[PDB]
Enzyme design. Structure first.
Site, PDB file in Angstrom:
ATOM      1  N   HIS A  40       0.800  -1.243   0.000  1.00  0.00           N
ATOM      2  CA  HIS A  40       0.000   0.000   0.000  1.00  0.00           C
ATOM      3  C   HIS A  40       0.829   1.289   0.000  1.00  0.00           C
ATOM      4  CE1 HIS A  40       0.239  -0.115   4.547  1.00  0.00           C
ATOM      5  NE2 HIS A  40       0.270   1.269   4.333  1.00  0.00           N
ATOM      6  N   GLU A  52      18.415   7.985   8.694  1.00  0.00           N
ATOM      7  CA  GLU A  52      17.607   9.059   9.295  1.00  0.00           C
ATOM      8  C   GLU A  52      17.377   8.890  10.798  1.00  0.00           C
ATOM      9  OE1 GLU A  52      16.706  11.804   8.282  1.00  0.00           O
ATOM     10  OE2 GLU A  52      16.223  11.812   6.109  1.00  0.00           O
ATOM     11  N   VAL A  57      15.538  17.354   9.428  1.00  0.00           N
ATOM     12  CA  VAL A  57      16.855  17.966   9.571  1.00  0.00           C
ATOM     13  C   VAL A  57      17.994  17.060   9.137  1.00  0.00           C
ATOM     14  CG1 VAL A  57      15.834  19.084  11.770  1.00  0.00           C
ATOM     15  CG2 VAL A  57      18.390  18.347  11.747  1.00  0.00           C
ATOM     16  N   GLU A  62      22.841  10.460   7.079  1.00  0.00           N
ATOM     17  CA  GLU A  62      21.889  10.027   6.045  1.00  0.00           C
ATOM     18  C   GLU A  62      22.561   9.493   4.787  1.00  0.00           C
ATOM     19  OE1 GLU A  62      21.902  13.177   7.378  1.00  0.00           O
ATOM     20  OE2 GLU A  62      19.864  13.522   8.231  1.00  0.00           O
ATOM     21  N   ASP A  84       0.077  -7.664   1.667  1.00  0.00           N
ATOM     22  CA  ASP A  84       0.539  -6.278   1.701  1.00  0.00           C
ATOM     23  C   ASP A  84       2.057  -6.151   1.846  1.00  0.00           C
ATOM     24  OD1 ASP A  84       0.447  -3.548   1.652  1.00  0.00           O
ATOM     25  OD2 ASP A  84      -0.482  -3.345   3.605  1.00  0.00           O
ATOM     26  N   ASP A 171      -0.497   1.506  20.224  1.00  0.00           N
ATOM     27  CA  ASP A 171      -0.615   0.892  18.895  1.00  0.00           C
ATOM     28  C   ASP A 171       0.027   1.703  17.774  1.00  0.00           C
ATOM     29  OD1 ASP A 171      -3.305  -0.219  16.692  1.00  0.00           O
ATOM     30  OD2 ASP A 171      -1.422  -1.156  17.222  1.00  0.00           O
ATOM     31  N   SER A 172       0.266   1.038  16.661  1.00  0.00           N
ATOM     32  CA  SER A 172       0.665   1.699  15.417  1.00  0.00           C
ATOM     33  C   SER A 172      -0.405   1.643  14.332  1.00  0.00           C
ATOM     34  CB  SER A 172       2.013   1.172  14.884  1.00  0.00           C
ATOM     35  OG  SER A 172       1.910  -0.204  14.502  1.00  0.00           O
ATOM     36  N   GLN A 174      -1.528   4.499  11.279  1.00  0.00           N
ATOM     37  CA  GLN A 174      -0.962   5.685  10.606  1.00  0.00           C
ATOM     38  C   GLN A 174       0.375   6.072  11.232  1.00  0.00           C
ATOM     39  OE1 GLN A 174      -5.451   7.163  11.165  1.00  0.00           O
ATOM     40  NE2 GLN A 174      -3.746   8.655  11.232  1.00  0.00           N
ATOM     41  N   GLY A 175       0.810   5.161  12.079  1.00  0.00           N
ATOM     42  CA  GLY A 175       1.864   5.300  13.074  1.00  0.00           C
ATOM     43  C   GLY A 175       3.176   4.841  12.477  1.00  0.00           C
ATOM     44  N   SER A 177       3.008   3.323   8.221  1.00  0.00           N
ATOM     45  CA  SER A 177       2.746   2.367   7.155  1.00  0.00           C
ATOM     46  C   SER A 177       4.073   1.898   6.594  1.00  0.00           C
ATOM     47  CB  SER A 177       2.030   3.091   5.993  1.00  0.00           C
ATOM     48  OG  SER A 177       0.655   3.210   6.287  1.00  0.00           O
ATOM     49  N   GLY A 178       4.192   0.623   6.393  1.00  0.00           N
ATOM     50  CA  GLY A 178       5.338   0.063   5.682  1.00  0.00           C
ATOM     51  C   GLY A 178       6.500  -0.196   6.617  1.00  0.00           C
TER      52      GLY A 178
HETATM   53 CA   LIG Z   1      17.660  13.670   8.960  1.00  0.00          CA
END
Ligand SMILES: [Ca+2]
Length: 223
Positions: A40, A52, A57, A62, A84, A171-172, A174-175, A177-178
């Site tokens: 999704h 990250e 920032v 990175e 999924d 919970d997760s 929208q916490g 996705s993926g």
């Molecule tokens: Ca960063």
């Protein structure tokens, strides 16, 4: 802290951010050239962002690498969120180090009551909208299938599992996705869906990665 907390910079070195001009999904580095995420999260023109912490920032660790390829699972159903899972190939190999590392694939499925680590950037609020900027973490057990299916009758397939607390609160949804669910150092889960958000008898629902390992190895070797 019982529940969501700040991981600490680069404490989850496999964690990847998918950026389309903004952070839109998580994903996990499984070798220098490949990322697993949720189907999704499929999008054109992904940039994968490794190393990250604060995604707004530039903090110095990175690595920003374009995706060259995305392969959605052949049997992905976007109505049911069954299968999924998606594989993302990097245009150039990542450089692996302390802060940018692969996570192993599982050799077996993890059992109910196993404590796992779930990570991501997404929404902290069950009721409202609050998007944090550094990586967040949660430790939650894998729930029994009975407990999972009873929370979402008719919605849970063999390719899903639930993790957390039947009382909700933690919970997760929208916490992120993926994003990964890692248990005993192996990638077991992908943040897929969950009705409501940390609601009482509404857990998180995850893609059961241990069902896909043959698929993932075969597909990455051929692409
Ligand atoms: Ca960063």
């Amino acid at each position: 802290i019982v529940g969501g907390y700040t991981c600490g910079a680069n404490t989850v070195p496999y964690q990847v951010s998918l950026n389309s001009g903004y952070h839109f999904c998580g994903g996990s580095l499984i070798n220098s050239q490949w990322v697993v995420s949720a189907a999704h999260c499929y999008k054109s023109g992904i940039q994968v962002r490794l190393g990250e912490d604060n995604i707004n920032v530039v903090e110095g660790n990175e690595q920003f690498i374009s995706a060259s390829k995305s392969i959605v699972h052949p049997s992905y159903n976007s109505n049911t969120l069954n299968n999924d899972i998606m594989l993302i190939k990097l245009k150039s190999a990542a450089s692996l180090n302390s802060r940018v590392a692969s996570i192993s694939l599982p050799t077996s499925c993890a059992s109910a009551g196993t404590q796992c680590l779930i990570s991501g950037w997404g929404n902290t609020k069950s009721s409202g909208t609050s998007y944090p900027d550094v990586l967040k973490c949660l430790k939650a057990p894998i729930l029994s299938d009975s407990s999972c299916k009873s929370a979402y009758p008719g919605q849970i397939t063999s390719n899903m599992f639930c993790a957390g607390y039947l009382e909700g609160g933690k919970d997760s949804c929208q916490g992120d996705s993926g994003g990964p669910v890692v248990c005993s150092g192996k990638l077991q889960g992908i943040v897929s869906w969950g009705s409501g958000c940390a609601q009482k008898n509404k857990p998180g629902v995850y893609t059961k990665v241990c069902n896909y390992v043959s698929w993932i190895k075969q597909t990455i070797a051929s692409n």
